[PDB]
Amino acid sequence: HGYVASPGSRAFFGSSAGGNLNTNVGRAQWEPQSIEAPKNTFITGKLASAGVSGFEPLDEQTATRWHKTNITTGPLDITWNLTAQHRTASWDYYITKNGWNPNQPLDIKNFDKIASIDGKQEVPNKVVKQTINIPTDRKGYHVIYAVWGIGDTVNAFYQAIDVNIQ
């Protein structure tokens, strides 16, 4: 189980692990690590919560709802913190396209896939640091969607991350 700690995920920032900076993240205030759903779950309006009961406040979406970490384009170091280390199948990353609507529910069709990293069925450390390429066209408020695919369960952990791209 785990979450993206850098840039802080939406769930992370709503929890004590992230300083309780985001408000009303439902269950993520107490269990940011538990956004667990089957692989290949990309339900419109349910990306941030992965459809998990009690995490629905994460699916709220306005231009001002969430804290947005400032980043640049180009290589971005992105760090997970794992509360339970599992053998890992994969790490996948997506980012919204310029012009996505920050006042409407999230839809994966409005994202591009930007990285896929093989986990090789290895057991990761509790801190996992990876580098992904933020496309150079991106500017403004965006959502990165990070997906940790577990090697020994049919599930993945899903992490929406709000950023402001300079």
Q: Is 86 annotated as a binding residue?
A: yes
Where residue 55 sits, what CATH number does that domain have?
A: 2.70.50.50
Technique employed here was: X-ray
Contact indicator for 22, 8 with CB cutoff of 8 Å: no
Rounded alpha-carbon distances, angstroms, from residue 37 to 16, 50, 98, 120: 23, 6, 27, 21
Domain count, the chain: 1
Cα–Cα dist 117/91, whole Å: 5
Rounded alpha-carbon distances, angstroms, from residue 10 to 7, 67, 125, 132: 9, 8, 22, 18
99 Cβ neighbours under 8 A, 6+ residues apart: none
The secondary structure of residue 10, as a DSSP letter, is: H
Resolution to one decimal, Å: 0.9
Contact indicator for 75, 132 with CB cutoff of 8 Å: yes
Phi first, then psi, for residue 11 (nearest 5°) are -65, -50
Phi first, then psi, for residue 109 (nearest 5°) are -65, -20
- Domain of residue 52 covers 1-166
Q: Is 12 exposed, middle or buried (0-12, 13-18, 19+ CB in 10 A)?
A: buried
